[PDB]
Amino acid sequence: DLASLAIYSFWIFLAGLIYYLQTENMREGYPLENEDGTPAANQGPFPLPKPKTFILPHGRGTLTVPGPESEDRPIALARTAVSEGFPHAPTGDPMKDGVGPASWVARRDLPELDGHGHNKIKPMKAAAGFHVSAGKNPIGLPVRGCDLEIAGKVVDIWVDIPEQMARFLEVELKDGSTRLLPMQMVKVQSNRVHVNALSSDLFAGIPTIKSPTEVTLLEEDKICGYVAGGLMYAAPKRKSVVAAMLAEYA
Amino acid sequence: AEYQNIFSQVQVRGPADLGMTEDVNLANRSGVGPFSTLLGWFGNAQLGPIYLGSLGVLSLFSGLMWFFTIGIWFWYQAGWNPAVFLRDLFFFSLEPPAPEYGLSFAAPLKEGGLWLIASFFMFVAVWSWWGRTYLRAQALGMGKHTAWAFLSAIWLWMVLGFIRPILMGSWSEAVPYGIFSHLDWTNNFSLVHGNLFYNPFHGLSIAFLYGSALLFAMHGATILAVSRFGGERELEQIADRGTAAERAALFWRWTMGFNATMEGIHRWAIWMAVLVTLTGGIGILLSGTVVDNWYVWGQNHGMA
Amino acid sequence: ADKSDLGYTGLTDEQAQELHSVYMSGLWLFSAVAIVAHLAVYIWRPWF
Amino acid sequence: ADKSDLGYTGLTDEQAQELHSVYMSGLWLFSAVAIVAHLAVYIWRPWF
Amino acid sequence: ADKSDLGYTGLTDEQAQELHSVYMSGLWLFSAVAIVAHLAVYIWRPWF
Amino acid sequence: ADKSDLGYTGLTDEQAQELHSVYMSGLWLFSAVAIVAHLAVYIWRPWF
Amino acid sequence: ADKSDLGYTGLTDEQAQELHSVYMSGLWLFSAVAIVAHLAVYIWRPWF
Amino acid sequence: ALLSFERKYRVPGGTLVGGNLFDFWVGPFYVGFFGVATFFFAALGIILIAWSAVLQGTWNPQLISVYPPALEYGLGGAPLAKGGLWQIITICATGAFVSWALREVEICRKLGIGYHIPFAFAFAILAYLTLVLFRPVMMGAWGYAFPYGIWTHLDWVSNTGYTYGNFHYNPAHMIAISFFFTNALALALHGALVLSAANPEKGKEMRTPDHEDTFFRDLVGYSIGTLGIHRLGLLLSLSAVFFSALCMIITGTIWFDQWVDWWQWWVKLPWWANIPGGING
Amino acid sequence: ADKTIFNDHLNTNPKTNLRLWVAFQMMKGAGWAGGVFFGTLLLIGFFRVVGRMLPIQ
Amino acid sequence: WMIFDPRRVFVAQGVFLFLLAVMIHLILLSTPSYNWLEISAA
Amino acid sequence: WMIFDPRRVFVAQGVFLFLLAVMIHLILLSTPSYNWLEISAA
């Protein structure tokens, strides 16, 4: 048709594009809030749109995103500097309130639903998935903490169907009160598991699941998030933990 | 035989779970393929089922017969022995009617032979398989975005042997057939049009292919990094922002200087895919009847 | 200690004995004194 | 603790408190000098 | 643990011991050092 | 353990026991090693 | 065939007793039919 | 600057030795212990494109040229603009890339995500550095490299890019495009994937993780999971870098001749050695 | 054995440094080695060491 | 929401008109007619 | 008030002038007709 023609519909329309896209990327999180709960200093060169249609996956009603941004979940920090930019500091222990590394938020009590008529996640004792018949079978195995010390025995699996991949290692204590712990943070070398995230004297800090079967969405934030709690902090400052944090490969 | 429980990765197998039933069919889905548990403790291990009929036994069969059309022009030169066939499994070659016959299908089986048949069986091997990334995208009630990166993908296929070399009066302007043949054409459209560098359409067609290792070099790293929280389930993180959507919405803001959402990261991933072969769709749709040279196009618009 | 709503911070007088006492170090020595820096400029060398 | 529905702010009367200082008069002398420092240029040098 | 008002930290009385000894005399350990250091730079070598 | 004043830290007089041996004598013998080198470098052989 | 007895691995303390053990003792009878053929090739055929 | 849920994540540390000495948030941008270093490297290298401008003859980004050192000066340096200024931008840019890939680790120890992100820019330091530290280092000097520009190395990738004949002939390269065409094969789908969940046709329920085994199994027949496409999307884009370094670790230092002279060791076989056949015959 | 603070010790003769350190912490270093410090210096370190006595003509 | 106040006019709106300056300046200072900076000597 | 006096006041004037002077040295090195030993060459 022409030598210089189609490009002047490319630097104009397709340049009206990173202005149409970056907003569809700056929805969740925005609008901007400061460090207490207050209309912020700005929003950006790509201002945020008012949310559109999001029909919910399991008839859960009406929620519009960008959605919850305000201060509903509990926050507590002891300020060391007042001007915006410098970090904050926990009041008590940083493993107590949940400020800094271990991150979560208050969600509504409903287990992730998929399809057939039951929750997304269940163990092997309930959802009789795959059993044990012939040969020697490694279900019921000892574990080691980040302090290089025995913690508990994992004796059951949490199975899956659509994605065929187990998710949790239910650590039952001697008390019988079960403690929960995610999947992409564990490494077993030989016969006994060795953890490097949480010591064997900090496992009750992660509270228990009130239902041994229900996997609600309020409770999938700390169980897989507290592992970060001892990834930032643990453990200052001298001695045997320095030979357990630095170096290494995997 | 039993099924092992290796030391924490982990896995438990899936039994007889097909999927959903609303608009698809399931009777043609005859048998769930035998599960190759290839120590499937990393990804998955599931085969079947799938959609069967004639919206399907046409792409395979036209793929086949297109696939069959170029391969016997590899056995044609061999000497009728299977030794030369794998020795030149690539050195053999095949093209359409001569640059002085072109549009004419009247080329015999001797010379400009087996290009009119493969492109005839290809033309029902990808225009009824784009009618299955667009139709099975409704087999339940979903969108069609899957065939909106496939309608700008068979668009670089809508110049190379369709729209250029048919209203240009030449089949030799359509691509040779096989493994080695078409590479004396990826270095033939290059000596000819004056080096396609100063051609910022093929050139900025490349500027949407060097960026799909700038969006996927980090996507398979970062969603493998937020996984220790629970953002691998990409259908409970968008509206119901998960705890892997607060281990990611700060990172790239702090780093390079802009974050996305869990609906947001799939909107730059396919705005660096629907424009790969589109700017090069326009970047082989303008390398023809405009200015034949791009060295004699790169001295008229580019410094002026 | 935690904070509340608009407009901490803010707010006073950590905005009046602080932010008022740090900001005007860029709206005078670069606003009015730059016109004294204009002195050796506003004729060297625009006029030929 | 934070805020409520659209908009807040808002709000009456909080709209004309933080959106009428460097936006109403902040873009008024910017327009004044856009006629003041333009009329001395209306004549030089569109004319030779 | 944190205090109340203006300002911290800090730190009365450290308006004339912390924010004037390594802050205003910094405009002396480099600004006044420039007075004697520049007396052999402005002529090397704008005047060749 | 930290103190109060300036520098503290400091840490008076850890401001004159560690800012002396490697701060002064480190940079004074970085001035007794750098100046001297020039005296075989200034003229060999920028002049050619 | 490996190194020692039930079980391995193994072992505590380990490493100071494994990879130090797979480069001498298993080479103690390899280098028992090796060094002989090295002294036979200290003269044929290096110097042609 | 911070998001609405960025009230809590604000915690110091992360950096290596010394303290929170460098770790201050400036804007949305993270300025950590590798922060005023990348402010140091950035405000030092943009003028390293403007240095070779008063000399070469081109201030314009069109044809700014800081050429690689001459092919034959040795293990030392070069002239000025033709290798010297080239050798100045050498530890300014490569000084910045890892003032940033271990400053990402100043955001990975700070929280507790997977250490897999400061790992994918690392292949960007395994195809670029297959051009400075690898090939130029041995066969003589830094002369076996390219000018820095946006265009100069283009007509360097073209004209001086047929020196191994026809490069499609190269088998390390071929298969460092065969991971560069499937690069975008598993993204044109994966990208449409999680838009059609929330927004189907109009007003229809959102989808769930079981409508992925009735669509892609309803597609090509394979379904390695929902996190099995962030582990076959990193099998797409990182590997177009070190099988391309492969035909830049074997190409010019071992086989500086044609690599179309490579596909004639497939016919030299006692079976079909003295007996030609197809095409060749 | 304890100050209740951290997880290790001060001095003493027994109880400590008898089977810590050279046991548990960084034991993966040598297992990772044997193929990285051995398989990447049979043509690089030996590459510039023969250039010594023979190249003296 | 949508657009706030005290952050744009300090570092962003300061490079919104300066950006709009050099997209006007870099056009009218090179035409074979005007100039008014170089054309003042010869 | 605020900021840092025992921290970021002896380190905000050590990599700040070096990030405004010594990086600025490179542009007056971008001369080779001036230059403080290139005068022999031109």
Next chain:
Amino acid sequence: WMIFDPRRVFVAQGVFLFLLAVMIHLILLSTPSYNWLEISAA
């Protein structure tokens, strides 16, 4: 301690004099017409 002793000036100033000396080496060891160690044969 005003600044850090066993942290900022036992090896970090060792890469301060080192960050200056060698970036200019490839300006003085370089140059198209100085050398006096390369040009001795031709």
Next chain:
Amino acid sequence: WMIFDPRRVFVAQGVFLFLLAVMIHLILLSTPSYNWLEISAA
């Protein structure tokens, strides 16, 4: 719902008067018959 106004006229339609203003202004300046403003030289 589904779309916006306080974001499509305060910052969108207000840039729709600058996006469309200058584009053809230089399309009718590239075509040499108007010019229209260059009264200086002549």
Next chain:
Amino acid sequence: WMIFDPRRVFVAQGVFLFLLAVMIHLILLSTPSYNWLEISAA
């Protein structure tokens, strides 16, 4: 630990010597110095 033996050391004793033997013999199976195997021909 961290290094395997039931799998990864049975390859370090069984065939590590066979490799470091015959693979180095490949090059000097036809060499213009040592020979000792192709010296004989007549």
Next chain:
Amino acid sequence: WMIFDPRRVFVAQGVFLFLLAVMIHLILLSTPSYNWLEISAA
């Protein structure tokens, strides 16, 4: 121990020689120095 018996002594003992021997009998069929069976005329 540390390796399976009925997979590296019985029938997998036949792939440590069957692969070792036949590949040693495929290098010297293109070489006319040995052969030992190709010449049967005289």
